[PDB]
């Protein structure tokens, strides 16, 4: 986040495994994996997407 020190806010970053409709609203997104990020306290956020698959390898 590259705003001013006087700005504040909160964000939700979500990952959804495949199979269902792509999320279009926060209510659908929060049901999958998600992280809540506070801009004021921290200027950077990190989210780890883990390996969850049916096959051992995925195509490029």
């Amino acid at each position: 986040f590259c705003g001013s020190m006087m700005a504040t806010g909160k964000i939700l970053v979500a990952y959804a495994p495949p199979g269902a409709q792509p999320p279009t609203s926060r209510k659908e997104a929060m049901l999958g994996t998600h992280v809540i990020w506070d801009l004021g306290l921290q200027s950077s956020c990190t989210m780890v997407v883990p390996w969850i698959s049916n096959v051992t390898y995925r195509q490029t």
């Binding site: 959804a16 199979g19 269902a20 997104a29 049901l31 999958g32 994996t33 883990p50 969850i52 049916n54």
Partner: protein
């Protein structure tokens, strides 16, 4: 002995009674491939409803007469709308489970007939048109109702609005193989003069430890009359057949929003 030394670094280059489950009870069984259902081995936290999903669900009863040619179902498709099992299926991306199938059919000592029940892994059926692999998702996943076999191949000669439906044939098992060899698969025979029920235990079978339960069906169940039904000297005879299936050792993973397929 003959001498041999491998030169290349790669291996490929080298030269070559009552059964109670959960809150359900039903009063010999067959285990497929002699392997009992089990959870994933040691080699994202999975969710596992121990008893909310591992219990017996009863499907719709069917009628067997003198002209019935057979019935078929797909698992886990048939249980997509059964309690919390379906909810877990549609709320997760990956699922795994084994099954216990129980077939019930009762008659009298003066009836005669024989049913063959077959459990088939990766049961792929043939279409009803010149186009290949053109069957639709909705028609390939009937659900609880299931489908039926036919005694002949009826081509769908309609290019305006193709049906895109299966056309199984009884003596070809619906897949181009002779029915007599279907006993290679796990099977049971219900002969009305000896017994009235059949039981099979199916472990999880697939090329992957876990896979989606929505776009892939792991098992198929086929019931066919090996001998026609008869009763005394009566022209018409009908008796009921019931199917009850219990999930066993079910795991789910990949929780997100719910999936809502368009079934027609």
């Amino acid at each position: 002995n003959y001498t041999t030394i491998n030169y290349y670094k790669d291996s490929a280059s080298n030269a070559a009674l009552q059964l109670t489950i959960g809150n359900s009870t039903i009063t010999n069984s067959v285990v497929a491939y002699g392997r009992w259902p089990e959870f994933i081995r040691d080699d994202d936290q999975p969710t596992e409803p121990d008893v909310a999903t591992c219990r017996f669900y009863t499907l719709d009863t069917v009628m067997w007469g003198k002209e019935s040619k057979g019935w078929w179902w797909k698992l886990p498709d048939a249980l997509r709308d059964m309690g919390l099992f379906g909810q877990n299926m549609y709320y997760h991306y990956l699922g795994r489970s084994g099954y216990t199938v129980h077939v019930q059919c009762n008659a009298s000592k003066f009836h005669q007939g024989a049913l063959g029940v077959f459990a088939i892994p990766e049961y792929c059926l043939a279409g009803d048109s010149d186009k290949q692999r053109y069957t639709s998702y909705a028609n390939a996943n009937p659900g609880e109702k299931g489908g039926k076999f036919y005694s002949q191949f009826n081509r769908d000669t309609a290019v305006t609005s193709p049906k895109r439906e299966f056309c199984p044939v009884d003596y070809l098992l619906g897949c181009g193989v002779l029915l007599g060899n279907a006993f290679v698969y796990p099977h049971q025979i219900i002969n009305l003069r000896t017994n009235n029920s059949a039981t099979i235990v199916l472990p999880y079978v697939n090329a992957m430890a876990i896979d989606s339960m929505v776009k892939h069906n792991n098992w198929g169940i086929a019931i066919l009359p090996l001998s026609p039904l008869d009763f005394a000297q009566e022209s018409s005879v009908e008796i009921p057949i019931t199917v009850t299936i219990a999930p066993m050792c079910s795991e789910f993973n990949g929780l997100r929003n719910v999936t809502a397929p368009k079934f027609q």
